Design a protein around this ligand. Structure first.
Ligand SMILES: Nc1ncnc2c1ncn2[C@@H]1O[C@H](COP(=O)(O)OP(=O)(O)O)[C@@H](O)[C@H]1O
Ligand SMILES: [Mg+2]
Lengths: 456, 177, 79, 109
């Protein structure tokens, strides 16, 4: 049957239905005079349901008629989504006409079972020195790029989309959750001009959008990736910012009648994160390699949202503002960043010992910072002086000019293999480069280029 | 807070006065009239106005009921209005009848079957329930084609299911679990 | 069921009909106003008060409308 | 008209007025028979206003009559205020007699 709007407060709307026709949780509803879509969140009793609007509520009023659709928000899936741009409700937003869909899938699903899990450990080379050394990625695994405002997450990801597409031959799915509309336009035209667009599905719900859109766009993109995984394919799933899915949930939580938790967050923070994160996994049917950017509020890694995200990832890349301030890019912190693949049984003893050696030197240099700041380097022991000199060279050799960063400075981009990465850091740890000047390691790709830069 | 939580003090006060003065049937009629009259589309509107005083709302409701409210019942309506509780009148009447039924050792039992049952069967179910519950039973018999056969008894919060639909559901859960 | 004599008494009651575009103020506090009866008001609509003052509709509830005053609220009063 | 004190909780006092005589926000009210002034802070509805007392509330009780003044707290202004000590309400706290005022202005504008 149909119901009537009884209350409106921002993005949240209450609708009353006959007692024998009350709609189900997550069921989609449509307002008769404007065609605005609503998603049911809870049943309040007496035939009243509470819902979130999937659009603007300006101009809506009490007493308007509402139609129940009998199902959840359903989006098109399969080959017809490749090279197309869609919104949260699966409508095309690229002016290229209707989607030639064969079937539609509901955006709400349970995670794959414990018996469906995949045990993959195959190494994925990124061509980025710091990541390949201390944060080795794996095919079918999950990566998170943690960082505050303006530290490098969108640049360091776009460099990964460019580098991973060299070896990968399958499809990709991109979900833009609460970020800049200009960057979605820049990425679409870049792929269209490069002829890469016919193998990528694009979904957007940017900062300009109301809370309901930003809250469900992640589910729409993941539903398209799950169709390709379940077809037996190996696909890449990119999420522009996973924190925005949680934040859109915070804006609406008090309107849903929930008591707040620590620092104003919704009481359901960890469950809302687990329900989405557990679906983003590889199975016995196919694989999903996923890269997600994680925003860090006010640079605080102890904040409830970032703190709750670390447990859902295989590789954690932590970007720092202190490192970015020195000039080093990518601004990764070797001591805070880590990966499940950093194991002697997965990467071999040579890589493992080189990575452990780099971390030991950088940790010891971090302990001397206060002594060096008050008394200077000249008071240190002859052993500490040699270690600090190698720490400064290692810290500079971790820097690398990217092919997406060329517009910012002018320098050409560099791709460094895992073999060249291990050889350079092993030589600096052994002392094979103790005579070269400290500035020769800054922005040079492979170790041989540091030898040529020292000639000037 | 449920409406039942807010109506409890008022329903209990009305019941104890009616019981002590031997007016149980008078208050049963008075509260029923107030519950029905306050739900009328024109009276419901009048009671929600922000410009009227509690005494003006009470007097208007008393003038409309008239003959059906004795001096104690009129005093009760003026008390409910002063505390701003006129929206609870339907719940107060419902809770008063529950206190009355429990006092008069009476139980209203709803009954449903696949197809009609004889007076011989109703009187056999009635004596069995009255012997189990130790109360007077009033069987509100009815039919529901959703049942494949048999009958279901609902004596308030207590339910006794002897229907075929319940047995088929037990089998579905036994095989699915 | 309500009786025909009582229904006749109800039809005689002094109950004021209110237009769907008009309302009455219930309360005023720190630039926020509560209004009773604006049945056809839209979310984000401009509300007109006496003395040239305007409000914006933010909370549309079952029994009342919550509005934020687009100027000085100290001249606004209950009723 | 006049209102009645309905509630007293420390320095916060609630006063009830007839529906056609509710005092405005920031209006000054006078308690009958006691030298106590109340400034109106909020209109709660049902003819009730919430106010703050400009002095001690000790000895006050519910049901006391209160009078509206028609304007905010109004104080003496001009030449007569020079060389004088006054309280928040403009009363002469020095033992030098009444202020030779020619005009009074409300404190809110
Ligand atoms: N070499 C660089 N020089 C200056 N800025 C850089 C450089 N490399 C990366 N960036 C910064 O990277 C940022 C990418 O997004 P970021 O601000 O870190 O994430 P977000 O916008 O999503 O919170 C850009 O805003 C840009 O300022
Ligand atoms: Mg960014």
């Amino acid at each position: 049957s149909s119901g009537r709007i009884v209350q409106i407060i921002g993005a949240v709307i209450d609708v009353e239905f006959p007692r024998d026709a009350v709609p189900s949780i997550y069921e989609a509803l449509k307002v008769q005079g404007v065609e605005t879509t609503l998603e049911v969140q809870q049943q309040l009793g007496d035939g009243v349901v509470r819902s979130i609007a999937m659009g603007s509520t300006e101009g809506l009023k009490r007493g308007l008629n509402v139609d129940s659709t009998g199902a959840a928000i359903s989006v098109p899936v399969g080959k017809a989504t490749l090279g197309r741009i869609m919104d949260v409700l699966g409508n095309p937003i690229d002016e290229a006409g209707p989607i030639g869909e064969e079937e539609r899938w509901g955006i709400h699903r349970e995670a794959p079972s414990y018996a469906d899990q995949a045990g993959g450990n195959e190494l994925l080379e990124t061509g980025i020195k710091v990541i390949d050394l201390v944060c080795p990625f794996a095919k079918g695994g999950k990566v998170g790029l943690f960082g505050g405002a303006g530290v490098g997450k969108t640049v360091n990801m776009m460099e990964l989309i460019r580098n991973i597409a060299i070896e990968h031959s399958g499809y990709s799915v991109f979900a833009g959750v609460g970020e800049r509309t200009r960057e979605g336009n820049d990425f679409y035209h870049e792929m269209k001009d490069s002829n890469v667009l016919d193998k990528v599905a694009l979904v957007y719900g940017q900062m300009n959008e109301p809370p309901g859109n930003r809250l469900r766009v992640a589910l729409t993109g993941l539903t398209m990736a799950e169709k390709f995984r379940d077809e037996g394919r190996d696909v890449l799933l990119f999420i522009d910012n996973i924190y925005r899915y949680t934040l859109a949930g915070t804006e609406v939580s008090a309107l849903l009648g929930r008591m707040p938790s620590a620092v104003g967050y919704q009481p359901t923070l960890a469950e809302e994160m687990g329900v989405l994160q557990e679906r983003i996994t590889s199975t016995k049917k196919g694989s999903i390699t996923s890269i997600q950017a994680v925003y860090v509020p006010a640079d605080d890694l102890t904040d409830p949202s970032p703190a709750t995200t670390f447990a859902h990832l295989d590789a954690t890349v932590v970007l720092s503002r202190d490192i970015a301030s020195l000039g080093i890019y990518p601004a990764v912190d070797p001591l805070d960043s880590t990966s499940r693949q950093l194991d002697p049984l997965v990467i071999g003893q040579d890589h493992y010992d080189t990575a452990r050696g780099v971390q030991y030197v950088l940790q010891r240099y971090k302990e001397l910072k206060d002594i060096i700041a008050i008394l200077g380097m000249d008071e240190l022991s002859e052993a500490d002086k040699l270690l600090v000199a190698r720490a400064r060279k290692i810290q500079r050799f971790l820097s690398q000019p990217f092919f997406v960063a060329e517009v910012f400075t002018g320098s050409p981009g560099k791709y460094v293999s895992l073999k060249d990465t291990i050889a350079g850091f092993k030589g600096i740890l052994n002392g094979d480069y103790d005579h070269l000047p400290e500035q020769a390691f800054y922005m040079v790709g492979g170790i041989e280029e540091a030898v040529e830069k020292a000639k000037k | 807070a449920e409406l039942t939580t807010l109506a409890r003090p008022y329903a209990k006060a009305a019941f104890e006065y009616a019981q002590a003065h031997q007016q149980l049937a008078d208050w049963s009629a008075a509260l029923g009239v107030l519950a029905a009259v306050s739900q009328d589309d024109t009276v419901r509107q009048l009671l929600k106005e922000p410009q009227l005083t509690s005494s003006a709302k009470a007097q208007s409701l008393i003038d409309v009921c008239g003959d059906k409210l004795n001096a104690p019942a009129q005093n009760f309506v003026r008390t409910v209005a002063e505390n701003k509780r006129l929206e609870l009148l339907p719940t107060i009447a419902e809770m008063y009848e529950q206190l009355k039924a429990e006092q008069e050792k009476s139980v209203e039992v709803e009954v449903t079957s696949a197809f009609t049952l004889s007076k011989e069967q109703q009187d056999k179910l009635a004596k069995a329930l009255s012997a189990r519950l130790s109360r007077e039973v009033r069987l509100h018999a009815s039919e529901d084609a959703s049942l494949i056969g048999g009958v279901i008894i609902r004596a308030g919060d207590l339910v006794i299911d002897g229907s075929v639909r319940g047995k088929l559901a037990k089998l579905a859960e036994a095989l699915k679990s | 069921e309500i009786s025909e004599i009582i229904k006749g008494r109800i039809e005689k009651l002094d109950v004021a009909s209110q237009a769907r575009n008009e309302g009455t103020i219930v309360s005023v506090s720190d630039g926020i106003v509560r209004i009773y009866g604006l049945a056809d008001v839209m979310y984000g609509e401009m509300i007109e008060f006496p003395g040239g003052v305007y409000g914006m509709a933010l909370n549309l509830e079952q029994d009342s409308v919550g509005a934020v005053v687009l100027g000085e609220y100290q001249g606004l009063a209950e009723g």
